[PDB]
Protein backbone atom coordinates (compact mmCIF):
# COMPACT_ATOMS: atom_id res chain seq x y z
CA UNK A 1 0.00 0.00 0.00
CA UNK A 2 3.15 2.17 0.15
CA UNK A 3 4.19 4.68 -2.52
CA UNK A 4 7.64 4.21 -4.08
CA UNK A 5 9.61 7.22 -5.33
CA UNK A 6 13.04 7.09 -7.01
CA UNK A 7 15.00 10.35 -7.13
CA UNK A 8 17.08 10.76 -10.29
CA UNK A 9 18.96 13.44 -12.27
CA UNK A 10 22.20 15.42 -12.51
CA UNK A 11 24.33 15.75 -9.36
CA UNK A 12 23.77 18.95 -7.36
CA UNK A 13 20.27 19.73 -8.57
CA UNK A 14 18.77 19.17 -5.12
CA UNK A 15 17.19 15.72 -5.16
CA UNK A 16 18.46 14.67 -1.72
CA UNK A 17 16.96 17.92 -0.42
CA UNK A 18 13.79 17.12 -2.41
CA UNK A 19 13.53 13.79 -0.58
CA UNK A 20 13.78 15.76 2.66
CA UNK A 21 10.98 18.17 1.65
CA UNK A 22 8.63 15.32 0.65
CA UNK A 23 9.26 13.21 3.76
CA UNK A 24 9.37 16.40 5.87
CA UNK A 25 12.44 15.39 7.92
CA UNK A 26 16.24 15.00 7.77
CA UNK A 27 16.39 11.82 5.66
CA UNK A 28 19.20 12.23 3.10
CA UNK A 29 22.29 14.44 3.34
CA UNK A 30 22.37 17.51 1.12
CA UNK A 31 25.86 18.49 0.03
CA UNK A 32 27.95 20.97 -2.00
CA UNK A 33 29.95 20.17 -5.16
CA UNK A 34 33.07 20.48 -2.98
CA UNK A 35 32.07 17.36 -1.04
CA UNK A 36 32.79 13.67 -1.61
CA UNK A 37 30.39 11.99 -4.07
CA UNK A 38 28.10 9.06 -3.14
CA UNK A 39 28.71 5.54 -4.47
CA UNK A 40 25.89 3.88 -2.54
CA UNK A 41 22.06 3.94 -2.40
CA UNK A 42 20.14 5.35 0.55
CA UNK A 43 16.49 4.72 1.40
CA UNK A 44 14.08 6.43 3.75
CA UNK A 45 10.51 6.16 5.01
CA UNK A 46 7.62 8.48 5.85
CA UNK A 47 3.92 9.04 5.18
CA UNK A 48 1.53 11.57 3.62
CA UNK A 49 -1.95 11.25 5.15
CA UNK A 50 -2.61 7.51 5.64
CA UNK A 51 -0.31 6.57 2.74
CA UNK A 52 3.25 5.47 3.56
CA UNK A 53 5.78 7.23 1.30
CA UNK A 54 9.01 5.39 0.44
CA UNK A 55 11.93 7.20 -1.23
CA UNK A 56 15.07 5.75 -2.83
CA UNK A 57 17.90 8.26 -3.33
CA UNK A 58 20.23 6.96 -6.09
CA UNK A 59 24.00 7.59 -5.86
CA UNK A 60 25.83 10.26 -7.89
CA UNK A 61 27.88 7.40 -9.39
CA UNK A 62 24.87 6.44 -11.54
CA UNK A 63 25.55 9.57 -13.64
CA UNK A 64 29.31 8.87 -14.10
CA UNK A 65 30.67 8.49 -17.64
CA UNK A 66 33.38 5.81 -17.92
CA UNK A 67 33.63 2.24 -16.56
CA UNK A 68 32.95 1.87 -12.85
CA UNK A 69 32.88 -1.70 -11.51
CA UNK A 70 30.85 -0.94 -8.36
CA UNK A 71 27.97 0.23 -10.61
CA UNK A 72 26.33 -3.12 -11.36
CA UNK A 73 25.91 -4.34 -7.77
CA UNK A 74 24.55 -0.93 -6.74
CA UNK A 75 22.00 -0.94 -9.56
CA UNK A 76 20.92 -4.38 -8.29
CA UNK A 77 20.70 -2.90 -4.78
CA UNK A 78 18.64 0.04 -6.11
CA UNK A 79 16.32 -2.37 -7.91
CA UNK A 80 16.06 -4.61 -4.83
CA UNK A 81 15.14 -1.68 -2.56
CA UNK A 82 12.52 -0.39 -5.02
CA UNK A 83 11.16 -3.88 -5.80
CA UNK A 84 8.71 -4.74 -7.24
CA UNK A 85 8.90 -1.31 -8.96
CA UNK A 86 8.56 2.45 -8.39
CA UNK A 87 5.21 4.22 -8.66
CA UNK A 88 7.07 7.42 -9.55
CA UNK A 89 10.52 8.34 -10.82
CA UNK A 90 11.29 11.90 -9.80
CA UNK A 91 13.65 13.61 -12.26
CA UNK A 92 15.19 16.60 -10.51
CA UNK A 93 16.43 19.64 -12.43
CA UNK A 94 17.36 23.17 -11.33
CA UNK A 95 14.99 25.84 -12.63
CA UNK A 96 16.42 27.86 -15.52
CA UNK A 97 19.59 25.76 -15.53
CA UNK A 98 19.09 22.71 -17.76
CA UNK A 99 22.33 21.72 -19.50
CA UNK A 100 23.99 18.95 -21.53
CA UNK A 101 24.86 17.16 -18.30
CA UNK A 102 21.14 17.20 -17.49
CA UNK A 103 20.14 15.71 -20.88
CA UNK A 104 22.89 13.17 -20.23
CA UNK A 105 21.48 12.28 -16.80
CA UNK A 106 18.00 11.86 -18.33
CA UNK A 107 19.61 9.45 -20.80
CA UNK A 108 21.12 7.34 -17.97
CA UNK A 109 17.71 7.01 -16.28
CA UNK A 110 16.39 5.56 -19.55
CA UNK A 111 19.49 3.37 -19.91
CA UNK A 112 19.20 1.97 -16.37
CA UNK A 113 15.44 1.80 -15.77
CA UNK A 114 14.01 1.60 -19.28
CA UNK A 115 13.02 3.84 -22.17
CA UNK A 116 9.41 3.86 -20.92
CA UNK A 117 10.24 4.66 -17.28
CA UNK A 118 9.67 8.20 -18.57
CA UNK A 119 5.92 7.40 -18.58
CA UNK A 120 6.14 7.13 -14.79
CA UNK A 121 8.45 10.14 -14.42
CA UNK A 122 7.59 13.60 -13.09
CA UNK A 123 10.01 16.50 -13.66
CA UNK A 124 10.79 18.39 -10.44
CA UNK A 125 12.19 21.91 -10.66
CA UNK A 126 14.24 23.08 -7.66
CA UNK A 127 14.93 26.70 -6.65
CA UNK A 128 11.24 27.66 -7.00
CA UNK A 129 11.99 30.99 -5.25
CA UNK A 130 13.61 32.26 -8.49
CA UNK A 131 10.12 32.52 -10.02
CA UNK A 132 9.34 35.17 -7.37
CA UNK A 133 5.82 33.83 -6.70
CA UNK A 134 5.35 33.43 -10.45
CA UNK A 135 3.62 30.56 -12.25
CA UNK A 136 5.77 27.55 -13.12
CA UNK A 137 3.51 26.67 -16.07
CA UNK A 138 3.80 30.18 -17.56
CA UNK A 139 7.60 30.03 -17.27
CA UNK A 140 7.62 26.69 -19.13
CA UNK A 141 5.31 28.01 -21.86
CA UNK A 142 7.80 30.84 -22.52
CA UNK A 143 10.96 28.71 -22.34
CA UNK A 144 13.50 28.63 -25.17
CA UNK A 145 15.29 25.53 -23.85
CA UNK A 146 14.50 23.00 -26.60
CA UNK A 147 15.98 19.96 -24.82
CA UNK A 148 13.93 20.60 -21.66
CA UNK A 149 10.80 20.78 -23.84
CA UNK A 150 11.71 17.28 -25.06
CA UNK A 151 12.06 15.96 -21.51
CA UNK A 152 8.83 17.54 -20.24
CA UNK A 153 6.94 16.22 -23.30
CA UNK A 154 8.37 12.72 -22.72
CA UNK A 155 7.07 13.02 -19.15
CA UNK A 156 3.60 13.90 -20.48
CA UNK A 157 3.76 17.53 -19.37
CA UNK A 158 3.94 16.54 -15.70
CA UNK A 159 6.03 19.20 -13.97
CA UNK A 160 6.52 20.61 -10.47
CA UNK A 161 8.44 23.26 -8.49
CA UNK A 162 10.11 23.03 -5.08
CA UNK A 163 11.82 25.44 -2.73
CA UNK A 164 13.80 22.96 -0.66
CA UNK A 165 14.40 25.51 2.12
CA UNK A 166 10.69 26.26 2.71
CA UNK A 167 9.39 25.48 6.21
CA UNK A 168 6.05 24.81 7.92
CA UNK A 169 2.91 25.44 5.86
CA UNK A 170 4.85 26.55 2.75
CA UNK A 171 6.45 23.10 2.76
CA UNK A 172 3.06 21.34 2.93
CA UNK A 173 1.69 23.46 0.08
CA UNK A 174 4.41 22.49 -2.42
CA UNK A 175 4.50 18.82 -1.39
CA UNK A 176 0.72 18.67 -1.86
CA UNK A 177 1.17 19.89 -5.44
CA UNK A 178 3.55 16.98 -6.03
CA UNK A 179 1.17 14.58 -4.23
CA UNK A 180 -1.54 15.87 -6.59
CA UNK A 181 0.54 14.87 -9.65
CA UNK A 182 1.33 11.44 -8.21
CA UNK A 183 -2.40 10.91 -7.57
CA UNK A 184 -3.34 12.06 -11.09
CA UNK A 185 -0.61 9.98 -12.76
CA UNK A 186 -1.57 6.89 -10.73
CA UNK A 187 -5.17 7.31 -11.87
CA UNK A 188 -3.92 7.19 -15.46
CA UNK A 189 -2.15 3.93 -14.54
CA UNK A 190 -4.94 2.41 -12.36
CA UNK A 191 -2.67 2.39 -9.29
CA UNK A 192 0.09 0.47 -11.09
CA UNK A 193 3.81 0.89 -10.48
CA UNK A 194 6.47 0.79 -13.18
CA UNK A 195 8.09 -2.61 -13.81
CA UNK A 196 10.51 -4.14 -16.33
CA UNK A 197 12.38 -7.37 -17.18
CA UNK A 198 14.91 -6.73 -14.41
CA UNK A 199 12.33 -6.44 -11.61
CA UNK A 200 10.86 -9.78 -12.78
CA UNK A 201 14.33 -11.31 -12.39
CA UNK A 202 14.40 -10.31 -8.69
CA UNK A 203 11.20 -12.42 -8.26
CA UNK A 204 22.53 -14.10 -7.52
CA UNK A 205 24.67 -10.98 -8.20
CA UNK A 206 26.31 -12.55 -11.29
CA UNK A 207 23.09 -13.36 -13.20
CA UNK A 208 21.68 -9.89 -12.52
CA UNK A 209 24.94 -8.22 -13.62
CA UNK A 210 24.77 -10.10 -16.94
CA UNK A 211 21.05 -9.36 -17.32
CA UNK A 212 21.63 -5.66 -16.57
CA UNK A 213 24.41 -5.28 -19.16
CA UNK A 214 22.10 -6.78 -21.79
CA UNK A 215 19.19 -4.57 -20.68
CA UNK A 216 21.22 -1.33 -20.78
CA UNK A 217 22.58 -2.35 -24.21
CA UNK A 218 19.03 -2.68 -25.59
CA UNK A 219 18.05 0.75 -24.23
CA UNK A 220 20.92 2.32 -26.20
CA UNK A 221 19.84 0.39 -29.30
CA UNK A 222 16.58 2.40 -29.39
CA UNK A 223 18.35 5.75 -29.11
CA UNK A 224 19.81 5.43 -32.63
N1 LIG B 1 18.13 27.80 -2.82
C1 LIG B 1 17.87 26.48 -2.99
N2 LIG B 1 18.89 25.61 -2.83
C2 LIG B 1 18.70 24.27 -2.98
C3 LIG B 1 17.36 23.78 -3.34
N3 LIG B 1 17.46 22.44 -3.43
C4 LIG B 1 18.75 22.11 -3.15
N4 LIG B 1 19.48 23.20 -2.89
C5 LIG B 1 20.92 23.27 -2.54
O1 LIG B 1 21.75 22.63 -3.52
C6 LIG B 1 22.86 22.00 -2.88
C7 LIG B 1 22.94 20.54 -3.32
O2 LIG B 1 21.81 19.84 -2.81
P1 LIG B 1 21.74 18.24 -2.84
O3 LIG B 1 20.47 17.76 -2.18
O4 LIG B 1 22.95 17.62 -2.19
O5 LIG B 1 21.71 17.97 -4.43
P2 LIG B 1 21.77 16.49 -5.07
O6 LIG B 1 23.19 16.15 -5.46
O7 LIG B 1 20.88 16.47 -6.29
O8 LIG B 1 21.29 15.46 -4.07
C8 LIG B 1 22.66 22.15 -1.38
O9 LIG B 1 23.58 23.13 -0.88
C9 LIG B 1 21.22 22.59 -1.21
O10 LIG B 1 21.02 23.50 -0.12
C10 LIG B 1 16.30 24.80 -3.50
O11 LIG B 1 15.13 24.48 -3.80
N5 LIG B 1 16.62 26.09 -3.32
MG1 LIG C 1 22.81 13.83 -3.15
Curated annotation (Swiss-Prot):
Subcellular location, record wording: Lipid droplet
Example of a GO MF term: identical protein binding
Region (G2): 36-40
Protein name stated in the entry: GTPase IMAP family member 2
Subunit structure, interactors included: Monomer in the presence of bound GDP and in the absence of bound nucleotide. Homodimer in the presence of bound GTP. Can form linear oligomers. Heterodimer with GIMAP7.
Organism: Homo sapiens
Stretches for region G1: 9-16
Boundaries of every AIG1-type G domain copy: 1-203
Consequence recorded when altering residue 97 to D: Abolishes GTP-induced dimerization
Start and end residues of each stretch annotated as G5: 163-165
Positions annotated to bind GTP: 11-17, 30, 37-38, 127-129, 164
Tissue: Detected in T-cells.
Region listing for G4, in residue ranges: 126-129
Region (G3): 57-60
Cellular component GO terms, alphabetical: endoplasmic reticulum; lipid droplet; nucleoplasm
Family listed: Belongs to the TRAFAC class TrmE-Era-EngA-EngB-Septin-like GTPase superfamily. AIG1/Toc34/Toc159-like paraseptin GTPase family. IAN subfamily.
Keywords carried by this UniProt record: GTP-binding, Lipid droplet, Nucleotide-binding
Function of the molecule: The heterodimer formed by GIMAP2 and GIMAP7 has GTPase activity. In contrast, GIMAP2 has no GTPase activity by itself.
Amino acid sequence: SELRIILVGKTGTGKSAAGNSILRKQAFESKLGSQTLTKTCSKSQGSWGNREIVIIDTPDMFSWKDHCEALYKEVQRCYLLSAPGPHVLLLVTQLGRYTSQDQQAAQRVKEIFGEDAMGHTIVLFTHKEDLNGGSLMDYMHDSDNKALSKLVAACGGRICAFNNRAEGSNQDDQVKELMDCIEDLLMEKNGDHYTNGLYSLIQRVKEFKQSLIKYMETQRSYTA
